[PDB]
Amino acid sequence: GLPFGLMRRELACEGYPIELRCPGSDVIMVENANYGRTDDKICDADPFQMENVQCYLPDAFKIMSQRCNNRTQCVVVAGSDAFPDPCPGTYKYLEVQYDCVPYKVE
Ligand SMILES: *[C@@H]1O[C@H](CO)[C@@H](O)[C@H](O)[C@H]1NC(C)=O
């Protein structure tokens, strides 16, 4: 509860599962998301794996959208066979931005 007033967003360290939940009877609506690494300050791991801060995966968006779209809550593995590999040997992550809208009207 208590919206952020600036879209909802969840991020999870590669290899661990991520959780999305919408308030009341709203449903998750994935707007944008990416699987990879664009920062070295998230999910502190070995420096060698955190050196590359430039890894993107567009399809990451479609995967989460299909999995969380129109759902009140959804859980996905921020790694494993649930996400390809846009940059091996690096500690990745998953960032998903979405909004919660009513499952019907009002
Ligand atoms: C969610 O529901 C709306 C209305 O029924 C539909 O247009 C939309 O396509 C659904 N989400 C997805 C991913 O299809």
Coordinates of C-alpha atoms and ligand atoms in Angstrom, one line a residue:
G1 CA 0.0 0.0 0.0
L2 CA 1.0 3.7 0.2
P3 CA 2.0 4.3 -3.5
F4 CA 5.3 5.9 -4.3
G5 CA 3.7 8.6 -6.4
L6 CA 6.1 7.7 -9.2
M7 CA 5.3 4.3 -10.8
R8 CA 6.1 1.1 -9.0
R9 CA 9.5 -0.6 -9.4
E10 CA 11.1 -3.8 -8.3
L11 CA 14.7 -5.0 -8.7
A12 CA 16.2 -8.3 -7.7
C13 CA 19.8 -9.7 -7.7
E14 CA 20.4 -12.2 -10.5
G15 CA 19.7 -15.8 -9.4
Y16 CA 17.1 -14.9 -6.8
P17 CA 13.3 -14.6 -7.4
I18 CA 11.4 -11.3 -7.7
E19 CA 8.0 -10.4 -6.3
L20 CA 5.4 -7.9 -7.7
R21 CA 2.1 -7.1 -6.0
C22 CA -0.6 -4.6 -6.8
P23 CA -2.8 -2.9 -4.1
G24 CA -6.5 -3.7 -3.7
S25 CA -8.0 -5.3 -6.8
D26 CA -5.6 -3.6 -9.2
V27 CA -3.5 -5.6 -11.6
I28 CA 0.1 -5.3 -12.5
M29 CA 0.8 -3.7 -15.9
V30 CA 4.4 -4.0 -16.9
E31 CA 5.6 -0.8 -18.6
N32 CA 9.3 -1.4 -18.9
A33 CA 12.0 -3.8 -17.7
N34 CA 15.4 -5.1 -18.5
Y35 CA 17.6 -8.1 -17.5
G36 CA 21.3 -7.4 -17.2
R37 CA 23.6 -4.9 -15.5
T38 CA 23.8 -1.1 -15.9
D39 CA 25.1 -0.3 -12.5
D40 CA 27.9 -1.6 -10.2
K41 CA 26.2 -0.4 -7.0
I42 CA 23.3 -2.8 -7.1
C43 CA 23.5 -6.3 -5.6
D44 CA 27.0 -6.0 -4.3
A45 CA 29.0 -9.1 -5.6
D46 CA 32.5 -9.8 -6.7
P47 CA 34.1 -6.7 -8.4
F48 CA 35.0 -8.7 -11.5
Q49 CA 31.4 -9.5 -12.1
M50 CA 30.4 -5.9 -11.2
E51 CA 32.9 -4.3 -13.6
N52 CA 30.6 -4.3 -16.7
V53 CA 27.9 -1.7 -16.2
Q54 CA 26.6 -2.1 -19.7
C55 CA 24.3 -5.1 -20.4
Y56 CA 20.7 -4.9 -21.7
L57 CA 18.1 -7.4 -22.7
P58 CA 14.9 -6.0 -24.4
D59 CA 13.1 -9.4 -24.4
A60 CA 13.3 -9.3 -20.6
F61 CA 10.3 -6.9 -20.9
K62 CA 8.1 -9.3 -22.8
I63 CA 8.8 -12.1 -20.4
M64 CA 7.8 -10.1 -17.3
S65 CA 4.9 -8.5 -19.1
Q66 CA 3.4 -11.9 -20.0
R67 CA 4.0 -13.2 -16.5
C68 CA 2.7 -10.2 -14.5
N69 CA 0.3 -8.4 -16.9
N70 CA -3.3 -8.3 -15.7
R71 CA -2.3 -10.1 -12.5
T72 CA -2.5 -8.8 -8.9
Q73 CA 0.8 -10.5 -8.1
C74 CA 3.6 -12.4 -9.9
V75 CA 6.9 -14.2 -9.1
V76 CA 9.7 -14.8 -11.5
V77 CA 13.2 -16.1 -11.3
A78 CA 15.6 -13.2 -12.0
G79 CA 17.9 -15.7 -13.7
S80 CA 17.9 -19.5 -14.4
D81 CA 16.2 -20.7 -17.5
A82 CA 13.7 -17.8 -16.9
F83 CA 16.1 -15.4 -18.5
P84 CA 18.5 -15.8 -21.5
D85 CA 22.1 -14.6 -21.1
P86 CA 23.0 -11.2 -22.5
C87 CA 26.3 -11.0 -20.5
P88 CA 27.9 -14.1 -18.9
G89 CA 30.7 -13.8 -16.3
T90 CA 28.9 -10.7 -14.9
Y91 CA 26.5 -10.4 -11.9
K92 CA 23.2 -9.4 -13.6
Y93 CA 19.9 -8.2 -12.3
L94 CA 16.3 -7.5 -13.2
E95 CA 14.6 -4.2 -13.1
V96 CA 10.9 -3.9 -13.7
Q97 CA 8.8 -0.7 -13.7
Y98 CA 5.0 -1.0 -13.7
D99 CA 1.7 0.5 -12.6
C100 CA -1.3 -1.0 -10.8
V101 CA -4.7 -0.5 -12.4
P102 CA -8.2 -1.7 -11.4
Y103 CA -9.1 -5.2 -12.8
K104 CA -12.3 -3.5 -14.1
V105 CA -13.6 0.0 -13.4
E106 CA -13.3 2.1 -10.3
Ligands
LIG1 C1 -5.1 -7.6 -20.2 O1 -6.5 -7.4 -20.3 C2 -6.8 -6.5 -21.4 C3 -8.4 -6.4 -21.5 O2 -9.0 -7.6 -21.4 C4 -6.3 -7.0 -22.7 O3 -6.5 -6.1 -23.8 C5 -4.8 -7.2 -22.6 O4 -4.2 -7.7 -23.8 C6 -4.5 -8.1 -21.4 N1 -3.1 -8.3 -21.2 C7 -2.4 -9.0 -22.2 C8 -0.9 -9.1 -22.0 O5 -2.9 -9.5 -23.2

